């Protein structure tokens, strides 16, 4: 439960995303919107279209938060507290949606980083995302 070998697989993997972090973030979002249309309801005010700039901008924000999370794996609830308030109290995002986003992020990583997305890495990534997700919905538990 973010476990020593888990970071490092996470840290290394986030490492190769590097400068692409934002575009992968946007891709994951677009992937989520198309596969799980119910999710688009939370973004009334956006242009959810492909290539969309707002989605591009949002992608960056999402990716930046994840980078900060990786950099703070051991202190995730303090580091993500504001986001937790936003997501649970303000937006009331359905907890299920976090699993969908997480899934779509993995899909994005697998498609872009074949050589890095090994089974072991996939597993660490999955737990990392689940732990981020738990923090983000902590306000309902």
């Amino acid at each position: 439960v973010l476990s020593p070998a888990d970071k490092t697989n996470v840290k290394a993997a986030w490492g190769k995303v590097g400068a692409h972090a934002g575009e992968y973030g946007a891709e994951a979002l677009e992937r989520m919107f198309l596969s799980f249309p119910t999710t688009k309801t939370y973004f009334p005010h956006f242009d959810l279209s492909h290539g969309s700039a707002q989605v591009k901008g949002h992608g960056k924000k999402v990716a930046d938060a994840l980078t900060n999370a990786v950099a703070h794996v051991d202190d995730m609830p303090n580091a993500l507290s504001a986001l937790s308030d936003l997501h649970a109290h303000k937006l009331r995002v359905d907890p299920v949606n976090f699993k969908l986003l997480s899934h779509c992020l993995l899909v994005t990583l697998a498609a872009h980083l074949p050589a890095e997305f090994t089974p072991a890495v996939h597993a660490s990534l999955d737990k990392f995302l689940a732990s981020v997700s738990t923090v983000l919905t902590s306000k309902y538990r």
Partner: peptide, 24 residues
């Protein structure tokens, strides 16, 4: 879902967003 990740891993860029949606 794991299967979807495996198709993505294998097909890279070919596994586009609309293709993933159909597979979903």
């Amino acid at each position: 879902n794991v299967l979807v990740c495996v198709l993505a891993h294998h097909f890279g860029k070919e596994f586009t967003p609309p293709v993933q949606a159909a597979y979903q």
